[model samples]
Target: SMTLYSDQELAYLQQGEEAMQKALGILSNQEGWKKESQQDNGDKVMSKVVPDVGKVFRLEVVVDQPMERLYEELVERMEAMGEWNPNVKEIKVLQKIGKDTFITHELAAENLVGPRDFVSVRCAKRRGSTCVLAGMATDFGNMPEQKGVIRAEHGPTCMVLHPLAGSPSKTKLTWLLSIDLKGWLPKSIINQVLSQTQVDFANHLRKRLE
Candidate 1:
């Protein structure tokens, strides 16, 4: 029942991809961010809080899996977030825009603050050796806010996978998240959750691949 958008809408989608590329640059270079934690396997997590803006969380990890295999695994696990992710309560696909693009709605579990939901335009693509999944908040007229769930309406979040040099069977994954909590939640709490979430996700992926 879902059809392709008009030319104008397609243009807007391209613009969103451009914006996500810009954010990816900032995510890779953490000039102003402080190192929050480091794991034994060379994984690093960092965070920065801008005065008027929200906290930016960044995570980098190198997994011992082929890039193609990792990409396949991520795509296969898209619909099963609740199985591996502790924070995701539910996820539904609103519409499929293309082979690897869709509009998705996700409900996050209650944290120290409360439960939240988000509607995002999600896209996946591969350039050179990097496979990226980029998502940003979108208004599709059909996605409406639900009671008891704070709607996250902004920020471009992404998960990137790049093959490691000289290591054909390894991948470097990076996750960048910069969403406005829209409440009185402290930056410290947000940082903790983001950091732990990345660790859990990486562990989950490693175990699944193993």
Candidate 2:
């Protein structure tokens, strides 16, 4: 009878042990058969060499609003972010730090399943016929400013608001939201979450704007 392994053990074997067995089998039987090194499998085996690099989550969203319209909505929404943003618990606008800068008192309700206090500077201004809004928060886990930055850039990734060819009232807006985990996340997992949230946020914003 073959011994059954637990799911966790199976995963461990697939990710490491089984891979080594295959490679060794190929090497040992290379007397006359042509051997091909599975570099893809080898890369997986080598991934465990790194002990740090943690995990991260990045997401983006594009809406169906003109540049000006979308820009204004983003500013108005961010100004009252605490009310709508579930992650942000409170935000207090402090004195101007620059010509168009101000100190923001930010409080995060949850720190991505950690004990980190999330907060950053809330900046909003305009450029040409477009509006730009951005902020950065430090993800400190049970300490002060421990992790890297969780920055947000809300602006035009692609100019979907050009000549009013379709309808003057309707303009397509493309905005990209990127999260840099600062070597704290695996790119594969981050890409997965970002793609999902991008769709979710875009739909939500479209409904809200309409």
Candidate 3:
């Protein structure tokens, strides 16, 4: 295959690959993170942030499912995420650039940041026993900015999965969420919603996996 994609498309895919590499960095250095959730919160969804990366939030959870099953639901059956996850209004895979890298548009429900949609290049693969489902925003020609809808952006964000120690039936998931909702939303509300939503996602997915 000698260059089938347009200049813009190739650029977008390149950015996606770069973002996946950055995701690996965040995964390695996990020593410093600001805890956002309350101490009494025992829901098992841990929320933390790294301010340097434009406020990248890291959410951690352990689900009662094997690594293979977790990867299957989160990657293979990705389009159906909207059905089980209420926070997601809809998800459309615009183009599959390769086996693991694809351009996708996700519509979020009327959220605290307001009505918004995201076009991203998502890559999911198992690297070193960890399934790295990394994604970053990408603008596609076929899907231009929609009317009356804000196009949000995320950078070097991912959900990495690992088999729970000595628990083959369980999977530990870590999500690095970095969304730049380009709107008039204040910092407090923006921080609150993004952090809270990740908790809901862990719980919702747990319910669905049951």
Give the clashing pairs for model 3.
Answer: none
**Model 1 regions more than 4 Å off:** 1-4, 28-30, 49-54
RMSD of 1: 3.2
Per-model TM-score versus the true fold = 0.85, 0.44, 0.89
Which one wins on TM-score?
3
As for TM-score, the candidate ahead, 1 or 2, is 1
Sorted by TM-score (best first), the order is: 3, 1, 2
RMSD of each: 3.2, 20.6, 2.5
Model 2, C-alpha of 199: deviation from truth (Å): 2.5
- RMSD after Cα superposition, model 3: 2.5
- What does candidate 2's lDDT look like per residue over 1-210, in tens digits? 556666543443333323223223332332332211122212101111111211222222233455666655555445565555554566555333433333344554432432223333334544564444444442222224535334332211111233235554544443323234344656566454444444444555556576
- What TM-score number comes out for model 1? 0.85
Q: Where does the lowest 10-residue lDDT sum fall in candidate 2?
A: 41-50
Backbone clashes in model 1, listed as residue pairs: none
Please estimate how well model 2 matches the true structure, expressed as its whole-model Cα lDDT. Answer: 0.38
Evaluated at residue 33, the lDDT of candidate 2 is 29
Q: Which residue runs does candidate 3 get wrong by more than 4 Å?
A: 1-9, 38-52
